[PDB]
Coordinates of C-alpha atoms in Angstrom, one line a residue:
Chain F
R24 CA -121.8 152.6 -45.4
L25 CA -118.0 152.8 -45.0
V26 CA -116.0 150.3 -47.1
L27 CA -112.4 149.7 -46.1
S28 CA -110.2 148.0 -48.6
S29 CA -106.5 147.3 -48.6
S30 CA -103.9 148.7 -51.1
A31 CA -101.8 145.5 -51.0
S32 CA -104.3 142.6 -51.6
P33 CA -107.3 144.5 -52.9
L34 CA -109.2 141.2 -53.4
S35 CA -109.0 139.9 -49.9
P36 CA -108.9 142.6 -47.1
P37 CA -107.2 141.7 -43.9
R38 CA -109.3 140.5 -41.0
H39 CA -108.9 143.8 -39.1
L40 CA -110.2 145.9 -41.9
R41 CA -113.3 143.7 -42.1
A42 CA -113.8 143.9 -38.4
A43 CA -113.3 147.7 -38.5
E44 CA -115.9 148.1 -41.3
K45 CA -118.3 146.0 -39.2
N46 CA -117.7 148.3 -36.2
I47 CA -118.3 151.5 -38.2
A48 CA -121.5 150.0 -39.5
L49 CA -122.7 149.5 -35.9
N50 CA -122.8 153.4 -35.6
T51 CA -121.9 153.3 -31.9
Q52 CA -119.2 156.0 -32.2
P53 CA -117.6 158.3 -34.9
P54 CA -115.9 156.6 -37.8
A55 CA -112.7 158.6 -37.1
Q56 CA -112.2 157.1 -33.6
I57 CA -112.3 153.6 -35.1
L58 CA -110.1 154.4 -38.0
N59 CA -107.6 155.9 -35.6
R60 CA -107.4 152.7 -33.6
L61 CA -107.1 150.7 -36.8
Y62 CA -104.2 152.8 -37.9
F63 CA -102.2 152.2 -34.8
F64 CA -103.1 148.5 -34.8
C65 CA -102.1 148.2 -38.4
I66 CA -98.8 149.8 -37.7
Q67 CA -98.1 147.6 -34.7
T68 CA -98.9 144.3 -36.4
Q69 CA -96.9 145.0 -39.5
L70 CA -93.8 145.8 -37.4
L71 CA -94.3 142.8 -35.0
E72 CA -94.3 140.4 -37.9
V73 CA -91.1 141.7 -39.5
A74 CA -89.4 142.0 -36.1
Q75 CA -90.3 138.5 -34.9
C76 CA -88.7 137.4 -38.2
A77 CA -85.4 139.1 -37.2
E78 CA -85.2 137.7 -33.6
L79 CA -86.6 140.7 -31.8
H80 CA -89.4 140.6 -29.3
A81 CA -92.1 143.1 -28.4
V82 CA -91.5 144.4 -24.9
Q83 CA -94.3 145.5 -22.7
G84 CA -94.4 147.2 -19.3
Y85 CA -91.5 149.5 -19.9
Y86 CA -93.0 152.2 -22.2
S87 CA -96.4 153.8 -22.8
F88 CA -98.5 154.7 -25.7
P89 CA -96.5 156.8 -28.2
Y90 CA -93.9 154.0 -28.7
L91 CA -93.7 150.3 -29.2
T92 CA -90.5 148.8 -27.8
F93 CA -88.5 145.9 -29.2
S94 CA -85.6 144.0 -27.7
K95 CA -83.6 140.8 -27.4
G96 CA -83.1 138.6 -24.4
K97 CA -79.3 139.0 -25.2
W98 CA -79.6 142.8 -24.6
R99 CA -80.5 142.5 -21.0
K100 CA -77.3 143.2 -19.0
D101 CA -76.3 143.4 -15.3
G102 CA -78.8 144.7 -12.8
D103 CA -81.8 144.2 -15.0
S104 CA -80.7 147.0 -17.2
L105 CA -81.7 146.5 -20.8
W106 CA -81.4 148.1 -24.2
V107 CA -84.4 148.6 -26.4
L108 CA -85.3 149.7 -29.9
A109 CA -88.2 152.2 -29.5
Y110 CA -90.5 153.4 -32.2
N111 CA -92.7 156.4 -31.8
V112 CA -96.0 155.6 -33.4
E113 CA -96.8 159.3 -33.7
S114 CA -93.4 160.6 -34.7
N115 CA -92.5 157.6 -36.9
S116 CA -89.0 157.8 -35.4
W117 CA -86.6 155.2 -33.9
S118 CA -84.6 155.8 -30.7
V119 CA -82.1 153.5 -29.2
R120 CA -82.4 153.6 -25.5
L121 CA -81.6 151.6 -22.4
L122 CA -83.5 151.7 -19.1
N123 CA -82.6 150.3 -15.7
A124 CA -84.4 147.8 -13.4
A125 CA -86.5 150.7 -12.0
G126 CA -87.8 151.7 -15.4
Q127 CA -86.0 155.1 -15.5
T128 CA -84.4 155.8 -18.9
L129 CA -80.6 156.1 -18.7
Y130 CA -79.8 156.9 -22.4
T131 CA -81.7 157.8 -25.5
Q132 CA -80.4 158.3 -29.0
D133 CA -82.6 158.9 -32.1
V134 CA -81.6 157.0 -35.2
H135 CA -83.3 157.5 -38.6
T136 CA -83.9 155.0 -41.4
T137 CA -85.5 155.0 -44.8
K138 CA -89.1 155.8 -44.3
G139 CA -91.8 153.1 -44.8
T140 CA -89.3 150.4 -45.9
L141 CA -90.2 148.1 -43.0
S142 CA -87.8 145.4 -44.1
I143 CA -86.1 142.6 -42.2
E144 CA -82.7 143.9 -43.3
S145 CA -83.7 147.3 -41.9
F146 CA -84.4 145.7 -38.5
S147 CA -80.9 144.3 -38.8
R148 CA -79.5 147.8 -39.4
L149 CA -81.3 149.2 -36.4
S150 CA -80.1 146.3 -34.2
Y151 CA -76.5 146.7 -35.3
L152 CA -76.6 150.5 -34.5
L153 CA -77.9 149.6 -31.0
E154 CA -75.0 147.2 -30.6
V155 CA -72.4 149.8 -31.5
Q156 CA -74.1 152.1 -29.0
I157 CA -73.8 149.6 -26.1
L158 CA -70.1 149.6 -26.9
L159 CA -69.7 153.4 -26.9
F160 CA -71.9 153.8 -23.8
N161 CA -70.0 151.2 -21.9
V162 CA -66.6 152.6 -22.8
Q163 CA -67.8 156.0 -21.7
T164 CA -68.9 154.6 -18.3
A165 CA -65.6 152.7 -17.6
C166 CA -64.0 156.1 -18.2
Chain H
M28 CA -136.3 128.3 -22.9
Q29 CA -139.8 128.9 -24.1
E30 CA -141.4 127.2 -27.1
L31 CA -144.6 128.4 -28.8
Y32 CA -146.6 125.7 -30.4
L33 CA -149.7 124.8 -32.4
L34 CA -150.8 121.4 -33.4
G35 CA -153.4 119.4 -35.3
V36 CA -154.5 116.0 -36.5
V37 CA -154.3 114.5 -39.9
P38 CA -156.0 111.2 -41.0
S39 CA -154.3 108.8 -43.2
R40 CA -155.6 109.6 -46.7
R41 CA -155.5 113.2 -45.7
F42 CA -151.8 112.7 -44.7
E43 CA -150.4 112.3 -48.2
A44 CA -152.4 115.4 -49.5
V45 CA -151.3 117.5 -46.5
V46 CA -147.7 116.4 -47.3
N47 CA -147.3 117.1 -51.0
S48 CA -149.3 120.2 -50.6
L49 CA -147.2 121.3 -47.6
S50 CA -144.2 121.1 -49.9
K51 CA -146.1 123.5 -52.0
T52 CA -146.7 126.0 -49.2
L53 CA -143.4 126.2 -47.3
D54 CA -139.8 125.2 -47.2
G55 CA -139.2 121.6 -48.4
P56 CA -139.3 118.5 -46.2
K57 CA -136.5 117.2 -44.0
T58 CA -136.6 113.5 -43.1
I59 CA -136.6 113.0 -39.4
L60 CA -136.3 109.7 -37.4
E61 CA -136.0 110.0 -33.7
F62 CA -135.7 107.4 -30.9
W63 CA -137.0 108.6 -27.5
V64 CA -136.8 107.1 -24.0
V65 CA -138.1 108.6 -20.7
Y66 CA -136.9 108.3 -17.1
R67 CA -138.5 108.5 -13.7
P68 CA -137.2 109.6 -10.3
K69 CA -137.1 106.5 -8.0
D70 CA -137.3 108.4 -4.7
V71 CA -140.8 109.9 -5.2
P72 CA -140.8 112.2 -2.2
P73 CA -144.5 113.2 -2.3
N74 CA -144.3 116.8 -0.9
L75 CA -142.0 118.8 -3.2
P76 CA -140.3 116.8 -6.1
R77 CA -143.5 116.8 -8.2
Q78 CA -142.2 113.8 -10.2
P79 CA -145.2 113.2 -12.4
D80 CA -144.6 116.1 -14.8
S81 CA -141.0 117.4 -14.3
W82 CA -139.4 114.0 -14.8
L83 CA -137.2 114.0 -18.0
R84 CA -137.0 112.3 -21.3
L85 CA -134.1 112.0 -23.7
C86 CA -133.8 111.2 -27.4
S87 CA -131.5 111.0 -30.3
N88 CA -131.3 111.0 -34.1
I89 CA -131.2 107.7 -36.0
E90 CA -130.7 108.8 -39.5
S91 CA -129.2 105.7 -41.1
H92 CA -127.7 103.2 -38.6
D93 CA -130.6 100.8 -38.0
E94 CA -131.2 100.0 -41.7
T95 CA -127.5 99.2 -42.1
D96 CA -127.1 97.0 -39.0
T97 CA -128.3 96.4 -35.4
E98 CA -128.9 99.8 -33.8
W99 CA -126.1 101.1 -31.7
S100 CA -127.2 103.4 -28.9
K101 CA -123.5 103.9 -28.2
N102 CA -122.8 105.0 -31.7
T103 CA -125.3 107.9 -32.2
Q104 CA -125.2 111.3 -30.5
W105 CA -127.7 111.8 -27.7
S106 CA -129.6 114.8 -26.3
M107 CA -131.7 115.2 -23.2
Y108 CA -135.0 117.1 -23.1
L109 CA -136.8 118.5 -20.0
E110 CA -140.2 119.7 -21.3
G111 CA -142.7 120.9 -18.8
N112 CA -146.5 121.1 -18.9
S113 CA -148.1 123.8 -21.0
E114 CA -149.3 127.1 -19.6
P115 CA -153.1 127.2 -19.0
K116 CA -155.5 130.1 -19.7
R117 CA -154.3 130.0 -23.3
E118 CA -157.5 128.8 -25.0
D119 CA -157.6 131.8 -27.4
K120 CA -153.9 132.2 -28.3
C121 CA -151.0 129.9 -29.3
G122 CA -149.7 127.5 -26.7
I123 CA -146.6 128.0 -24.6
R124 CA -144.5 125.0 -23.4
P125 CA -141.2 125.6 -21.5
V126 CA -138.4 123.3 -22.8
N127 CA -134.7 122.9 -21.9
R128 CA -132.3 120.6 -23.6
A129 CA -128.6 119.6 -23.6
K130 CA -126.4 117.6 -25.9
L131 CA -124.5 114.7 -24.3
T132 CA -121.3 113.1 -25.6
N133 CA -118.5 110.7 -24.4
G134 CA -120.5 108.9 -21.8
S135 CA -123.0 106.2 -21.0
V136 CA -126.2 108.2 -21.2
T137 CA -128.3 105.3 -19.8
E138 CA -126.0 104.5 -16.9
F139 CA -125.7 108.2 -16.2
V140 CA -129.4 108.8 -15.9
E141 CA -130.0 105.7 -13.8
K142 CA -127.0 106.7 -11.6
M143 CA -128.8 110.0 -11.2
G144 CA -131.5 107.9 -9.8
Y145 CA -133.9 108.1 -12.7
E146 CA -135.2 104.9 -14.1
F147 CA -136.8 103.6 -17.3
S148 CA -140.5 104.6 -18.0
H149 CA -141.5 104.4 -21.7
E150 CA -139.7 104.1 -25.0
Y151 CA -141.2 105.4 -28.3
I152 CA -140.2 106.3 -31.8
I153 CA -141.0 109.6 -33.7
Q154 CA -141.0 109.3 -37.5
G155 CA -142.0 111.9 -40.0
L156 CA -141.1 115.1 -41.9
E157 CA -140.4 118.7 -40.9
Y158 CA -140.8 121.8 -43.0
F159 CA -139.4 125.3 -42.5
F160 CA -140.7 128.8 -42.2
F161 CA -138.6 131.8 -41.0
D162 CA -137.5 130.9 -37.5
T163 CA -140.5 128.6 -37.1
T164 CA -140.5 124.9 -37.9
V165 CA -143.4 122.6 -38.6
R166 CA -143.2 118.8 -38.4
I167 CA -145.8 116.2 -39.3
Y168 CA -144.9 113.0 -37.6
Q169 CA -146.2 109.7 -36.4
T170 CA -145.6 107.9 -33.2
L171 CA -144.2 104.4 -34.0
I172 CA -143.7 102.1 -31.0
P173 CA -140.6 99.9 -31.5
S174 CA -140.8 96.2 -32.2
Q175 CA -138.4 95.7 -29.3
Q176 CA -136.2 97.7 -26.9
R177 CA -133.7 99.4 -29.2
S178 CA -135.7 97.9 -32.1
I179 CA -134.0 97.2 -35.5
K180 CA -135.1 98.9 -38.7
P181 CA -137.3 96.3 -40.5
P182 CA -140.1 96.3 -38.0
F183 CA -141.3 99.9 -37.2
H184 CA -144.3 98.8 -35.1
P185 CA -147.2 101.3 -35.3
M186 CA -149.3 102.3 -32.3
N187 CA -152.8 102.2 -33.8
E188 CA -154.6 100.9 -36.9
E189 CA -156.0 104.3 -38.0
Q190 CA -152.4 105.5 -38.0
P191 CA -153.2 109.2 -37.6
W192 CA -150.5 111.8 -38.1
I193 CA -149.8 114.7 -35.7
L194 CA -149.0 118.3 -36.7
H195 CA -146.5 120.3 -34.6
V196 CA -145.6 123.9 -35.1
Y197 CA -142.2 125.0 -33.7
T198 CA -141.2 128.4 -32.4
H199 CA -138.5 129.1 -29.9
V200 CA -137.8 132.2 -27.8
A201 CA -134.7 132.2 -25.6
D202 CA -135.8 134.8 -23.0
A203 CA -139.1 134.3 -21.3
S204 CA -139.3 137.8 -20.0
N205 CA -139.0 139.8 -23.3
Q206 CA -142.5 140.9 -24.4
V207 CA -141.3 142.1 -27.8
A208 CA -139.8 138.7 -28.7
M209 CA -143.0 136.9 -27.5
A210 CA -145.0 139.3 -29.6
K211 CA -143.0 138.6 -32.8
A212 CA -143.0 134.8 -32.2
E213 CA -146.8 135.1 -31.6
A214 CA -147.3 137.0 -34.9
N215 CA -145.0 134.6 -36.8
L216 CA -147.1 131.8 -35.4
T217 CA -150.3 133.6 -36.4
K218 CA -149.2 134.2 -39.9
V219 CA -147.9 130.6 -40.4
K220 CA -151.1 129.3 -38.8
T221 CA -153.2 131.3 -41.2
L222 CA -151.5 129.8 -44.2
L223 CA -151.4 126.4 -42.6
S224 CA -155.1 126.8 -41.7
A225 CA -156.0 127.2 -45.4
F226 CA -154.2 124.0 -45.7
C227 CA -155.8 122.3 -42.7
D228 CA -157.2 123.5 -39.4
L229 CA -155.1 123.2 -36.3
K230 CA -155.2 124.9 -32.9
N231 CA -153.7 125.3 -29.5
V232 CA -154.2 122.5 -26.9
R233 CA -152.9 121.9 -23.4
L234 CA -149.4 120.3 -22.9
Chain R
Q10 CA -86.7 134.3 -60.6
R11 CA -84.2 133.4 -57.9
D12 CA -83.9 129.8 -58.9
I13 CA -85.2 128.1 -55.7
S14 CA -86.6 124.5 -55.8
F15 CA -90.1 124.0 -54.5
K16 CA -93.1 121.7 -54.8
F17 CA -96.7 123.1 -55.1
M18 CA -99.0 120.1 -54.1
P19 CA -102.5 121.7 -54.0
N20 CA -105.6 119.7 -53.0
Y21 CA -108.8 121.4 -54.2
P22 CA -112.1 120.2 -52.7
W23 CA -113.9 120.0 -56.0
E24 CA -111.6 117.2 -57.0
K25 CA -113.2 115.0 -54.3
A26 CA -116.9 115.5 -55.3
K27 CA -118.9 112.3 -55.7
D28 CA -121.9 114.0 -57.4
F29 CA -123.0 117.6 -58.3
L30 CA -124.6 118.6 -55.0
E31 CA -121.3 117.6 -53.4
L32 CA -119.7 119.8 -56.1
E33 CA -121.9 122.7 -54.9
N34 CA -120.9 122.3 -51.2
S35 CA -117.4 122.0 -52.5
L36 CA -117.4 125.4 -54.1
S37 CA -119.1 127.0 -51.1
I38 CA -116.2 126.0 -48.8
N39 CA -115.0 128.5 -46.2
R40 CA -111.3 127.6 -46.1
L41 CA -108.8 125.3 -47.7
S42 CA -105.3 124.2 -47.1
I43 CA -102.5 124.2 -49.7
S44 CA -99.3 122.6 -48.7
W45 CA -96.0 123.8 -50.2
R46 CA -92.5 122.4 -49.8
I47 CA -89.4 124.5 -50.4
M48 CA -85.8 123.3 -50.9
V49 CA -83.4 126.2 -50.4
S50 CA -80.2 124.3 -51.1
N51 CA -79.3 120.6 -51.7
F52 CA -77.6 120.2 -48.2
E53 CA -80.1 122.3 -46.4
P54 CA -83.2 120.5 -45.1
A55 CA -86.4 121.4 -46.8
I56 CA -88.7 124.1 -45.3
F57 CA -92.4 123.7 -45.8
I58 CA -95.3 126.0 -45.3
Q59 CA -99.0 125.5 -45.7
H60 CA -101.0 128.4 -47.2
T61 CA -104.5 128.6 -45.6
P62 CA -106.7 131.1 -47.4
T63 CA -110.1 131.8 -45.9
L64 CA -113.2 132.9 -47.9
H65 CA -114.3 135.5 -45.3
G66 CA -110.9 136.7 -44.2
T67 CA -111.4 135.4 -40.7
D68 CA -108.2 133.7 -40.0
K69 CA -105.5 136.5 -39.8
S70 CA -102.6 134.0 -40.4
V71 CA -102.7 132.9 -44.0
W72 CA -99.3 131.4 -44.3
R73 CA -98.0 128.9 -41.7
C74 CA -94.2 128.4 -41.9
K75 CA -92.5 125.2 -40.5
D76 CA -88.8 124.6 -40.6
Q77 CA -86.4 122.5 -38.6
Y78 CA -86.4 123.8 -35.0
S79 CA -89.0 126.6 -35.5
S80 CA -92.4 127.6 -36.8
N81 CA -93.9 131.1 -37.3
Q82 CA -97.0 132.4 -39.0
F83 CA -97.2 135.1 -41.7
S84 CA -99.9 137.4 -43.0
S85 CA -98.3 138.6 -46.2
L86 CA -96.8 136.8 -49.1
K87 CA -94.1 139.4 -49.3
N88 CA -93.3 138.6 -45.7
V89 CA -92.8 134.9 -46.3
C90 CA -90.8 135.7 -49.5
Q91 CA -88.3 137.9 -47.6
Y92 CA -88.3 135.2 -44.8
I93 CA -87.0 132.7 -47.3
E94 CA -84.5 135.4 -48.2
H95 CA -83.6 135.5 -44.5
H96 CA -83.2 131.7 -44.6
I97 CA -80.4 132.1 -47.2
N98 CA -78.3 135.2 -46.3
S99 CA -75.0 134.4 -48.0
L100 CA -76.6 134.6 -51.5
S101 CA -79.3 137.1 -50.6
Chain D
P20 CA -96.8 117.3 -25.9
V21 CA -95.4 117.1 -22.4
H22 CA -96.9 119.4 -19.7
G23 CA -96.6 119.8 -16.0
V24 CA -99.2 120.9 -13.5
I25 CA -97.9 122.5 -10.3
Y26 CA -99.8 123.9 -7.4
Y27 CA -99.1 125.9 -4.3
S28 CA -100.9 126.5 -1.1
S29 CA -98.6 128.7 0.9
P30 CA -100.0 132.2 1.8
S31 CA -97.0 133.9 0.2
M32 CA -98.0 132.2 -3.1
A33 CA -101.4 133.8 -2.3
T34 CA -100.3 137.4 -3.0
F35 CA -98.1 136.2 -5.9
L36 CA -100.1 136.0 -9.1
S37 CA -100.4 139.6 -10.4
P38 CA -96.7 140.5 -9.7
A39 CA -95.8 137.1 -11.1
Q40 CA -97.4 137.7 -14.4
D41 CA -96.2 141.3 -14.6
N42 CA -92.6 140.3 -13.9
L43 CA -93.0 137.4 -16.3
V44 CA -94.0 139.7 -19.2
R45 CA -91.6 142.4 -18.4
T46 CA -88.4 140.4 -17.7
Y47 CA -88.9 137.3 -20.0
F48 CA -91.0 139.0 -22.8
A49 CA -94.1 136.8 -22.3
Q50 CA -97.1 137.2 -24.6
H51 CA -100.6 137.1 -23.1
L52 CA -103.0 134.8 -24.8
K53 CA -106.5 133.9 -23.6
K54 CA -107.5 134.4 -20.0
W55 CA -108.1 131.1 -18.1
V56 CA -111.1 130.4 -15.9
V57 CA -112.7 127.2 -14.8
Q58 CA -115.7 126.6 -12.5
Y59 CA -116.4 123.6 -10.2
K60 CA -119.7 122.9 -8.6
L61 CA -120.7 120.2 -6.2
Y62 CA -124.1 119.1 -4.8
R63 CA -126.2 116.0 -4.3
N64 CA -129.8 115.0 -4.3
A65 CA -132.0 114.2 -1.2
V66 CA -130.9 110.5 -1.4
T67 CA -127.2 111.4 -0.9
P68 CA -126.0 110.9 -4.5
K69 CA -123.0 113.1 -5.3
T70 CA -122.9 115.0 -8.5
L71 CA -120.4 117.6 -9.6
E72 CA -119.8 119.5 -12.8
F73 CA -117.0 121.8 -13.9
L74 CA -116.5 124.1 -16.8
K75 CA -113.3 124.9 -18.5
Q76 CA -113.8 128.2 -20.2
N77 CA -111.4 127.4 -23.0
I78 CA -113.4 124.5 -24.2
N79 CA -116.6 125.4 -22.5
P80 CA -118.6 123.8 -25.5
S81 CA -118.0 120.4 -23.7
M82 CA -118.9 120.6 -20.0
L83 CA -117.7 117.6 -18.1
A84 CA -120.0 116.4 -15.3
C85 CA -119.9 113.3 -13.1
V86 CA -122.3 111.5 -10.8
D87 CA -121.1 110.7 -7.3
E88 CA -117.4 110.0 -7.8
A89 CA -117.8 107.2 -10.3
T90 CA -119.7 108.1 -13.5
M91 CA -119.1 111.0 -15.8
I92 CA -120.4 112.4 -19.2
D93 CA -119.8 115.4 -21.4
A94 CA -122.8 117.6 -21.7
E95 CA -124.1 121.1 -22.2
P96 CA -124.5 124.0 -19.8
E97 CA -128.3 123.7 -20.3
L98 CA -128.1 120.3 -18.6
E99 CA -127.0 122.0 -15.4
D100 CA -130.1 124.2 -15.7
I101 CA -132.2 121.1 -16.2
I102 CA -130.9 119.7 -12.9
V103 CA -131.7 122.9 -11.1
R104 CA -135.3 123.0 -12.5
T105 CA -135.9 119.4 -11.4
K106 CA -135.0 120.5 -7.8
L107 CA -134.3 116.9 -6.9
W108 CA -130.6 117.8 -6.7
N109 CA -129.5 120.0 -3.8
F110 CA -127.7 123.3 -3.5
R111 CA -124.4 124.2 -5.2
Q112 CA -120.8 124.4 -3.8
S113 CA -118.5 126.4 -6.0
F114 CA -114.8 126.5 -6.6
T115 CA -113.2 128.6 -9.3
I116 CA -109.9 129.2 -11.0
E117 CA -109.0 132.5 -12.7
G118 CA -105.8 133.5 -14.3
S119 CA -104.4 133.9 -17.8
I120 CA -102.3 131.9 -20.2
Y121 CA -98.9 133.2 -21.4
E122 CA -96.6 132.0 -24.1
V123 CA -92.9 132.4 -23.3
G124 CA -90.3 131.2 -25.8
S125 CA -90.5 127.5 -26.1
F126 CA -93.4 126.8 -23.7
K127 CA -96.8 128.0 -22.7
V128 CA -97.8 128.4 -19.1
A129 CA -101.0 129.1 -17.1
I130 CA -100.9 131.2 -14.0
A131 CA -104.2 131.1 -12.1
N132 CA -105.6 131.7 -8.6
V133 CA -107.8 129.0 -7.2
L134 CA -110.5 130.2 -4.7
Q135 CA -114.1 129.9 -3.7
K136 CA -116.1 133.1 -3.6
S137 CA -112.8 135.0 -3.6
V138 CA -111.7 133.3 -0.4
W139 CA -108.0 132.6 -0.9
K140 CA -105.2 132.8 -3.3
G141 CA -103.5 129.4 -3.7
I142 CA -101.9 129.4 -7.1
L143 CA -101.9 126.8 -9.9
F144 CA -99.4 126.7 -12.7
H145 CA -99.6 124.7 -15.9
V146 CA -96.6 124.5 -18.3
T147 CA -96.8 122.8 -21.7
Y148 CA -93.3 122.4 -23.1
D149 CA -93.1 122.3 -26.9
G150 CA -90.5 119.7 -27.6
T151 CA -89.2 116.3 -26.8
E152 CA -92.2 114.6 -25.3
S153 CA -89.9 112.4 -23.2
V154 CA -91.2 113.0 -19.7
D155 CA -87.8 112.5 -18.1
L156 CA -86.1 115.2 -20.2
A157 CA -89.0 117.7 -20.1
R158 CA -89.5 117.5 -16.3
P159 CA -86.1 119.1 -15.5
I160 CA -86.3 121.6 -18.4
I161 CA -89.7 122.7 -17.1
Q162 CA -88.6 122.6 -13.5
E163 CA -85.5 124.6 -14.4
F164 CA -87.5 127.3 -16.2
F165 CA -90.1 127.5 -13.5
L166 CA -87.4 128.0 -10.9
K167 CA -85.7 130.6 -13.0
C168 CA -88.8 132.6 -13.8
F169 CA -90.3 132.6 -10.3
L170 CA -87.1 132.5 -8.2
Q171 CA -87.7 135.4 -5.8
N172 CA -89.9 133.3 -3.5
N173 CA -88.7 130.0 -4.9
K174 CA -86.4 129.4 -2.0
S175 CA -89.2 130.2 0.4
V176 CA -91.9 127.6 -0.4
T177 CA -92.6 124.1 -1.8
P178 CA -95.6 122.8 -3.7
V179 CA -98.2 120.1 -3.5
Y180 CA -99.0 119.1 -7.0
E181 CA -99.7 116.4 -9.7
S182 CA -96.7 115.2 -11.6
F183 CA -96.1 116.3 -15.1
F184 CA -96.8 113.9 -18.0
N185 CA -97.2 113.7 -21.8
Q186 CA -100.6 114.3 -23.5
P187 CA -101.3 115.4 -27.1
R188 CA -103.8 118.2 -26.4
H189 CA -102.4 121.7 -25.7
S190 CA -104.7 122.1 -22.7
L191 CA -105.0 119.7 -19.8
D192 CA -107.8 117.2 -19.7
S193 CA -111.0 118.4 -18.0
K194 CA -111.5 115.1 -16.2
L195 CA -108.0 115.5 -14.6
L196 CA -108.9 119.0 -13.5
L197 CA -112.0 117.5 -11.7
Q198 CA -109.7 115.1 -10.0
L199 CA -107.6 118.1 -8.8
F200 CA -110.6 119.9 -7.3
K201 CA -111.8 116.6 -5.7
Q202 CA -108.4 116.0 -4.1
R203 CA -108.4 119.7 -3.1
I204 CA -111.6 119.9 -1.1

C-alpha cells in the first residue's frame, strides 16, 4: 500500500496526507489522481496560512483553477474595481492584476520572487510591489 | 433495528459454575445494573393501535448512585426501548426480535411519557453480568423486583425463591433487508451457540 | 537564540493518574493541551498560544495563537515562530 | 457571545439567498464553513396531543422534541422512528431551513432559506458577533454590518424577527429555533 510521509515533520504526517493515504488504499481511482489533488491542496493551504499572517485574504469568485487570488479590503477602489495578487498553481508565478466590477481584467503584470521561500516577508514584498503599481497605473490613467 | 437472540435457563448452583466457567470461554465479565419501567397507552382504541405488544418500556444504568445515597432518577442518563414480539416460524433457527432505542437527556422522562399519554405499567430491575464475543454479546442476569418504587440499594428484592438466572445472547443487525448481514449474524450466533452449548444448552424461544 | 521571554507550563495526563490502570488510559490518550505564554517585550502585553498535538493527526490546527485583539491557528512550528517575528518587526 | 437573529418574508427576499452569498464572498471575502440545515416536524396522536420535533444538523446528536406546546426533551432520531412504529401519533407536517454559514471578518453569519417542500423562499439570517457581549453595542454594529453587506434591496424591505441577545454558544439554541417555527406557522 502507498505510504505518504512528510519531509518536514517526518514523525507526525499532516492530516491531509493521512487522509490521502486512506483514499489511495480504498482503490477507487488511480493513485496519481489523488496525489495530484493533494499537491494542489498542499500548495493552497501553505500559502493561505502565511498570507493570513500578513493581512491578506483569499479571494474567490474572480478567478478560476490555475490561480489562487489574494487581496486586501483596502485594495478595493472606486466602482468595485480591485487589485489582486494572483499565483498560478501550474506556473508557480505571481502576477499583480486588477479587475473591475464586471470581472474583466484591466491590467496584469508578472512579478517574480525567490522560488519556494514562502515567507511572510515575501508576502510583504509582493504587496509593496502591487502598491507601487496602483500608483503607476493611476498616474497613467489621469494622463 | 433487528436483534438476533438465543436464551437459556440456569439454576442457582449451576449459576456460579456457568459464570466462572464463562469467564474461561469468552471475553471477561462487565457488571450490569439496570432499572426498567414500562408505560401503556391510555386511549386503547381497539381497532388499530394494538397496544398490548407495541407499548414501550424504558430503562437506565444505575452503576453506583443507589449504594451511595437515595436513587436519583433525575441524575442518571435514560434511554427508551421499543422491542416488538419475536418472529414466529423460527423453531429451528435463532430468534429474531425487532428493537429500536433512543437516548434521552435534558428532560423529565417520566413527565414526557405520561404527557405523550402513556402511563405506568410495571417496574423491574435487571442485575447481572455480560460477556463479549466479536460483535455478539451474552448476558446472564436475574430479574430483581425493587423493594419500592425507585428502590434504594440495600434491599434488592428478588422475584422467586429458586432465583433462577436467565441467559441472553446479543446480536444486532442495522438493516433488516440485507441477507448477507443476516447470514453472518446467524453464523456468528451458531458458532457462539456451539461453544456456549458445550457450556450449557440454550435455544431459541418466542419473544 | 533570540532572547525572548516565555513560560512553558505543560500538563501531562500521566501526572494525574490515581492507580496503574489509570496510568494505562493516560498513556493511551488521543490528544493533549500544552499552554505556552510568550512575553515579547516588557511593555508589550504577553501573547499566549496553546499547542494541541493529536496522536492520530486528526486535528489540522496544532498551534492556537491568542493575542490582544486577535487569534489565529497555525499548522507548523516554523509558521508560529515567524509569526512572533512578525509581532516584533523593529528588531526582526 | 452576542448574536442576532433576523428574518424576512418579503418575496424579493425570496430570490435573494444565492446572489446574496455570492456577493458576500466576492465583495467582502467571506469564507464558507459548514452548510446549515434544520428540519421541523409537527403531528399529534388520535386524542389531539401535539408533538413536534426538530433537528439542527449542526448538533444533530441531540434532537430536541416537545409534547404539545408545553413539555420538551432531548432525544435521538431513533425515538422519532419509535413514534412512527407505534402509529398512535398521526402524520407529519414538515418545515425545513437550508443555507450555509459564512465567517466574515469579526462575525459569523448564517444565510438560509426557510420553506416546506420547497414552497417558498423567506430568508433567515443569524449573525454571531465576536466581541463585546454588551447587547446594546453589538446590536448597532451587527445592524450596521448587515445593512452594509446586503444594502441593494435594504431600502426595499423590512423584517419580522426575534431580537438579538447574548448567549455563550456559537450556535443558537435549538429550543429557540422551535419557538421560531411555532410562531411562523
